[PDB]
Amino acid sequence: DLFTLSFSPDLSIASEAEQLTLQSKDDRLILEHPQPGLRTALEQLKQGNLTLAQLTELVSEQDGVEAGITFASELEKLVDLGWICHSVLPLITAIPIAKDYELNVPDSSWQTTAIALSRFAFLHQDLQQLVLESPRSKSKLVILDWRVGAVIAKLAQSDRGFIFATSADSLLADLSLELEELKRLFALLIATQMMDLEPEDETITQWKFHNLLFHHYTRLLPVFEHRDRYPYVKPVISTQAIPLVKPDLTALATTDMTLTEAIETRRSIREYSDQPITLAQLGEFLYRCARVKAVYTLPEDPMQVGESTTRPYPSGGALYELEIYPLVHQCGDLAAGLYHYQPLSHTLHPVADWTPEVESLVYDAWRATGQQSIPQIVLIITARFGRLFWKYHDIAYSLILKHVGVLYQTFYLVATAMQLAPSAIGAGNTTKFCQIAGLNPDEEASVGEFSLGAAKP
C-alpha cells in the first residue's frame, strides 16, 4: 500500500528445485515445495521495485486467487522480522534495523495536525549516502533525493507548529516535488517514528540527544591488527623514573582491614589533613590498586592478542587500557606537576612541571570536590582506546566507563584501608589533559578523575 517493497540487502535467497531458503545473520526461514508465482513474487521482492498489490497479482497469475490472499497474509510475517524495506521511489527508503518490525501508515488527520521533526532524528553520511537515523526509531532512512533533504531542512527550520494542509503550498512552490510524492514522504516519515504528532512527552524530555543515542546503541572473529601499535603497557614517556615502594602483600593480607569493615566504613573524605600524603603511601596505593601481577601470553589466541597483563581489577576481555597519571600538587617527597604511573615497573615518570595548565586542572578538581580543602594528589585515569576498540564496535566506551567505575571502587576501598581521603570525580576536561600531557585525543584521552590525600584522625 502506497509503498514499494524490497528485501533487506543482508538477506540471501537460496533457490532449490523443491525448497527455498531466506538467510539472515540471526535466523533463517526455509519453505518446502513452493508453487511458482510465490517463487516469482519472492524473486521480484529480491528485485524490490513492486507494490504489495503487484506481488499479490504475480502470485495470483500463476497460483490462483486464494494463494494470492495467502501470500498477502504471509508477507507480514517477513515484515515483522525486519527483512522488508519500504520505499518512496526515488525519494527515500526505510530499511529495518530491529526485529519485531512494524510500519504504521498514519491516519489522514496528520495532514491537518501540527507536526515537527523529532529532536532525536539526525542526518549523517553512513558511507557514500545520506541517512536519517533516530534512537526512537526501528528504521533507517536512506535519502535517495536531495529534495527530501530540502524538505527536512525546511520543516526543521520551520516553527513549532507545522500543518501540512496549510504549509504544503510553500513546499510545492519552492520544490519540484509532486503533492502525492510529498504526502508519501511525510507518511513514511511519520510511520518511521521520525515525526512528532504529539507536542511533547514528559518521559523523554529529560533525555539528552547524545545520552539517548549512546544508550540505544550500546544496549543493542576480529583480529588485533594494530597489536604492535598498542602494547600492554604504555611506552616510557620520560626515562627519568622515581621508584615506588612495594609492600609485602602476605603480611598485609592479615594486617589490613576486613573487607566487610572496609565496605561498611568507607566514606568520601574531602577535607585533607595538614600532613600531606607521602610518596610511600602513594606507592602502596598504586601497588595495591593498579599494579601488574604477571605478564602472560595465551597459548592459542586467534585474535593475535599477544601479551596481556593481569591487574587487581577486572576488564572486558583483558586488554587493560587504563593508564594512571598521578598529578601531584602537594606531596611529601615530590614536587608539583603531572606524572605518569607504569604498572609493570612500579615507577612514575614526570610529564609536566607546575605550569598554570596543571594548576587549571587542579582548580577544576578542587571546585568539583566542593572547595573543602586543597587537593594533595589527583589521579587521572586515561584510556588508550586502540587497546579494545578493535574487539568491541559499539560497546567499547561503556566498557571503559565501567572499568573506570571499578577502579573508583578499588581506590575508595584501598584508601579507606590506608586511612587516606578518597573521592571520585564526576567529570573532567579531556582536551586540557590532551594539551598538558601531549596525547593523541583520538588514540588516548582522559576518562576519569579521583582525588586522594591524608585524612586527619
Add this chain to the structure above:
Amino acid sequence: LDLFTLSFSPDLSIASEAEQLTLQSKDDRLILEHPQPGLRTALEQLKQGNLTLAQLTELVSEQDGVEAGITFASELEKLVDLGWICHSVLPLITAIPIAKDYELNVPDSSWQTTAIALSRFAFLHQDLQQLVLESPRSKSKLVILDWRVGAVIAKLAQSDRGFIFATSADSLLADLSLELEELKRLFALLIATQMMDLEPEDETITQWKFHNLLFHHYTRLLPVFEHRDRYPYVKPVISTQAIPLVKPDLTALATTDMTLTEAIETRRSIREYSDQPITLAQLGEFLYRCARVKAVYTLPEDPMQVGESTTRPYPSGGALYELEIYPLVHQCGDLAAGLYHYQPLSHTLHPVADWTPEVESLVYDAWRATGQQSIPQIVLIITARFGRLFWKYHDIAYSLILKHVGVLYQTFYLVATAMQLAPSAIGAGNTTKFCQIAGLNPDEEASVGEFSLGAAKP
C-alpha cells in the same frame, strides 16, 4: 582575505551601564570603563551583527583614529579567542563557538580544486526551533538559516567519490538559486569549522564510531528536583507478595571476613558453577552486604529540594542512588525460576514474572555472553531509574550511571570472592527484552548492566 560577518554570541550577556561596559560569560568576564565612542559604535554594530572585521576596523578608525582602529583590530582577536564572536554568511549559515580557545581559519583557495567530502561525524538535527549542524571534532555549531544550505549539504553527502568545487560547482549553481560568491563563502565556512574533510580522515579516527565519539566529546567537556515525588529514594513495591532475605551479622563479619587485600588478590571471574546451586541465604547475605539501604536521611539545608536520600555500601554521585537490582533466578536454592526485584530498605524480593520463554531468552543471552560455561544460576540485572539522576546532571548523567554500574560490579566481585561465590560481569544485554518482560517505560528505567552469580566448586 576577510569574508565573514562578525556577530556577538547569543550565550554572552551584555551589561550596558553608565560609563562602564561588561561582557559576561560562564567561564570569564570582561569589564571596561571609559569606553571611546569608536569602541562603543563597534560593539553596537557587533550586537547588530552585519559587518565584517574590516568594516568594524574602518568604523573605529573613522570615529576614534587610525591607531585606535589598529588597536581595536588587535583587541578583537582576544574576544574571538574566548568564543564570544559568531561568524556568519548571511542569510545562509552562522557558526557559533561552543568551546574556549576559539579559532577560525579561512582555508587557502586551493580547496576549490581539491577533492573534499562531508565529515561522517557532522550531523544535522533540530535544536530548539532551528536546524543545526554539529560535530564532535568541531569547535563550532552551525545554525542553518536557509534551507538551500541544507540542500547543498544533502547533495554533498549524497555525492559519491570526491567532490571538487571547481568542476562540480556549476551543477549546484544551476540546480539552486545560490550565487557563486555565496556558495564559496558557505564552503569556506564549512571547511574552516572542521565540518569538511580534505584528507581521507585518519587511521586513529577510523577506530571511532559516531555515537562513541559524540558521547565522549559531550560528557568530557542550581538545579531543583522538581519531579522528586515521581522518583523516590526507593522504588515503590511492584507486588505485595514479598519473600524475606536473611540479614547477616555485620558486626561479626567485620572481624571474621577476609581482609580487603586478601579479597583483591584472590578475586577472579568464575564461570564454572557447582552442581549444588547457590542458596537463598547466600543471595540474601550478598544483597545485604552489597546494595542494601543502611539509613534514610534528609539534608538539613538543601536548596535543590532533594528530600529523602539513602546511604548504601557503594558510592554514587550526589547520593540519590538510582540503581535497582532485578535478580533473575534460573536456578536458586529455595526460589522458583523467574524474574524478581530486590528491595534494599526492607531487604526483600518481589516477583515480576515467572519462567516465561522470554525470561529463558534472557538466560540464554547471558549464558552465551558468559562463554557457555555450565548453566547460569543467578543473573542480577542492574537498571537505572533515570528520572532520579537526570535532573542534576545534564550531560554526564549516563556516564555517571555507567561508572556506578562499574562500582557495583567491583563490589559484587569482592563480596562474592569473600563468600566463595562465582561472580562474572557481563558486557552488554538486551534492554528492550527486559523492558518487554517488566512493565517499565524504557525512557524512565532501563537495564544498564548484567552480572552472573553462583557457587564455586571446592
